[PDB]
């Protein structure tokens, strides 16, 4: 049971992963900018296609009775997944970085055609970055009729370090630094932008209370003129974030117009009208925050979902690379080491399941469709069963 427990663990992951990934594959075609997830879904799909072939080798305890070409293709594909997934995640972190830090220069970059062009480069770079895997993917001459399928380094007693370090450096070290750097600039930019709108908004309230207590035409004009400058500044400051530009920009036409409505009355000296005209601005200010809070709540949902996808991958595979670097110092594995090594890989391959599953969970639109789709499909089958059940009564 112990020997056959491990193949069942990977089979459960592959079964869930294939089903889980196909769910996103079907749903998206029928958060992330609708592009990177599609490519990232394929990486799990392609990796899991070769998963059962690798499982049988573990079942055979060193048997690859499937072909030397299969060993070269499948092993490279498995080693390609770490480089492809992280680069796609790195691109997603970079893509969100440009959309929030350099929105003006990234307008042309974020295009449906341009994004697909970058993905093709990432796949090509992934295959280029796994060239050593291609060179030494030949069948291991296992004793007897069986043949092993691994990496045949020319000097395994000496080349083990550089091959292992190169994967960690490029697939787990470098992308984590870039992704983390991208997501600390974004959080600072978002915090600075959100602390700027409320700072400009607070300028309105302080001036707004002046006009209510203002008793002359001179004070009203100066108080309103400060409001308009902040209103224009806040209007231009809206164009600095992704989910804060196509929705928070239209309203400022009313706010600037109403200020101009009061400003013209202030210049004419009709202070009583000017105060009355300014009095209606409190309904604009009261509606300013609600759309701000609604948008600010939504921009945290986008950021958390984007980080959660990236964070899961670099957390599940973190313990595996701990042992991978540890085994460099400790060449001989112990009984606990084998259990830890098997356990770490199981956690690492759990990323196949979470990435489609967690993405659907952290959005109310997808689960609404799934609840809708499941019920109608079952009910359509039930009435089709009824179409046989009422037929059994009638037909």
């Amino acid at each position, epitope marked *: 049971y112990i020997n056959i427990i491990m193949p069942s663990v990977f089979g459960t992951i592959c079964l869930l992963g294939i089903i889980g990934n196909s769910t996103v594959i079907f749903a998206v075609v029928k958060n992330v900018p609708d592009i990177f997830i599609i490519n990232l879904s394929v990486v799990d799909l392609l990796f899991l296609l070769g998963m059962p072939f690798m499982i049988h080798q573990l079942m055979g305890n060193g048997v690859w009775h499937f072909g030397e070409t299969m060993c070269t293709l499948i092993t490279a594909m498995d080693a390609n997944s770490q480089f492809t997934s992280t680069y796609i995640l790195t691109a997603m972190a970079i893509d969100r970085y440009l959309a929030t830090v350099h929105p003006i220069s990234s307008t042309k970059f974020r295009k449906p055609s341009v994004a697909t062009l970058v993905i093709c480069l990432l796949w090509a770079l992934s295959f280029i970055s796994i060239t050593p895997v291609w060179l030494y993917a030949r069948l291991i001459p296992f004793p007897g009729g069986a043949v092993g399928c691994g990496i045949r380094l020319p000097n395994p007693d000496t080349d083990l370090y550089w091959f292992t370090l190169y994967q960690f450096f490029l697939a787990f070290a470098l992308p984590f630094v870039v992704i983390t750097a991208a997501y600390v600039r974004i959080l600072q930019r978002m915090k600075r932008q959100l602390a700027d709108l409320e700072d400009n908004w607070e300028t309105l309230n302080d001036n707004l209370k002046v006009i209510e207590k203002a008793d002359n035409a001179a004070q009203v004009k100066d108080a309103l003129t400060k409001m308009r400058a902040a209103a224009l500044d806040a209007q231009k400051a809206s164009g600095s974030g992704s989910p804060e530009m196509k929705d928070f920009r*239209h*309203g400022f036409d009313i706010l600037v117009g109403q200020i101009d*409505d009061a400003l013209k009355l202030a210049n004419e000296g009709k202070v009583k009208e000017a105060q*009355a*005209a300014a009095e209606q601005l409190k*309904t604009t200010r009261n*509606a300013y925050i*609600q*759309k701000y809070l609604l948008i600010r709540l939504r921009t945290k949902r986008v950021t958390r979902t984007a980080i959660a996808i990236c964070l899961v991958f670099f957390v599940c595979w973190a313990p595996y690379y701990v042992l991978q670097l540890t085994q460099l110092s400790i060449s001989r594995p112990t009984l606990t080491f084998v259990y830890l090594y098997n356990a770490a890989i199981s956690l690492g391959y759990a990323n196949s399941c979470l990435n489609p599953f967690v993405y659907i969970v952290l959005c109310e639109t997808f689960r609404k469709r799934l609840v809708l789709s499941v019920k109608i499909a079952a009910l359509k089958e039930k009435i089709a069963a009824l179409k046989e059940k009422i037929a059994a009564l009638k037909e």
Partner: antibody
Amino acid sequence: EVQLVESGGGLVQPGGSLRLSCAASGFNIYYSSMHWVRQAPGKGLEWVASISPYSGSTYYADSVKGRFTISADTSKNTAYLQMNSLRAEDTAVYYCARPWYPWSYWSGLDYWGQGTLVTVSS
Amino acid sequence: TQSPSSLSASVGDRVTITCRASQSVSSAVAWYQQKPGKAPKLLIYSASSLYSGVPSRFSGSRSGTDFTLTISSLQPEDFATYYCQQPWSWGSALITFGQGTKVEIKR
């Protein structure tokens, strides 16, 4: 008494130009806010555009922004609605209404015109 | 999008016309009455104040995010379609009219 007499409505092919006029009597249009509200046959009231002649600020609805051009003529005490790129759904009855105060359009449009019918059909 | 609702009531009944907003309404709704083939007329402004020429029967309430227009004693000339001016939301149009509620004779 505030009276709002309108004209200019009639037949016009799609893509044509039709300037709707809203004559105003009993008040000065300069210190006011003239709003155009259209009601499609069998549908409810829908806002179109507004203008404040004293300040010059002009607002439009999203569905008609860039196609209409509302303006006012203080000399003739009339408000115009220049309609361009008319479509099939623009067929409605266009009222010109103003609130009691020029800044109280959120408290209701007290005074309403008689309304004019714009029929767009090829 | 949505056809105006139907509210059947007889003469002398106490009708309640309700319009629902997406946020907390704060004295930003006005009620219009439109008879068929006529321009709409204003009934209640500032959601609590009677309008000139409007009897005391019309009165505006406020129940959470829903604002209601109450007619204490329905009259034969009060059978028309009633439109509600939605409180302004950021980014929307300057003035937005809600769906009407047609009040019709009950039999």
